[PDB]
From Swiss-Prot:
The modification N-acetylmethionine is found at M8. Changing R55A: Abrogates phosphopeptide recognition. It is found in: Nucleus. Residues 13-113 form the FHA domain. Monomer. Interacts (via FHA domain) with XRCC4; mainly interacts with XRCC4 phosphorylated by CK2 but is also able to interact at much lower level with unphosphorylated PNKP. It comes from the Eukaryota. The chain holds residues 1 to 106 of 522 of the full protein. This is Bifunctional polynucleotide phosphatase/kinase. It comes from Mus musculus (Mouse). Plays a key role in the repair of DNA damage, functioning as part of both the non-homologous end-joining (NHEJ) and base excision repair (BER) pathways. Through its two catalytic activities, PNK ensures that DNA termini are compatible with extension and ligation by either removing 3'-phosphates from, or by phosphorylating 5'-hydroxyl groups on, the ribose sugar of the DNA backbone.
């Protein structure tokens, strides 16, 4: 038959925000574009099972507005947003490529953005 519905439309190439993990790590999680906050910490999320990590260690938010990500510490352990240490109740930003050491300056989460070629 004829499916139809819609025709065509495209402004730019656009993309999607996500986090990149090193070998022996979890898959590429796609942050919520809606603007929600993806709390990272212990669990299958990042495969982190360190007590030092808290279910809600920090709050990541995908900001496709300017290809950025907001980070807010809701845990106790001091998190590092790149090369700067955070605090409890503090908040910072992460750029495309920047790292986000969940805790113990370990379990770094590289911020990546999807972008296809050709077109």
């Amino acid at each position: 038959g004829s499916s139809g519905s819609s025709g065509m439309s495209q402004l730019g190439s656009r993309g999607r925000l996500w986090l990149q993990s090193p070998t022996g790590g979890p898959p590429p999680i796609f942050l919520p574009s809606d603007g929600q906050a993806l709390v990272l910490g212990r669990g299958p999320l990042t495969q982190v099972t360190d007590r030092k990590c808290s279910r809600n260690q920090v709050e990541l938010i995908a900001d496709p507005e300017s290809r950025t990500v907001a980070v807010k510490q809701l845990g106790v352990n001091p998190s590092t947003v790149g090369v700067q240490e955070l605090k409890p109740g503090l908040s910072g930003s992460l750029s495309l490529g920047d790292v986000l050491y969940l805790v113990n300056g370990l379990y770094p989460l590289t911020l990546r953005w999807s972008g296809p070629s050709s077109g």
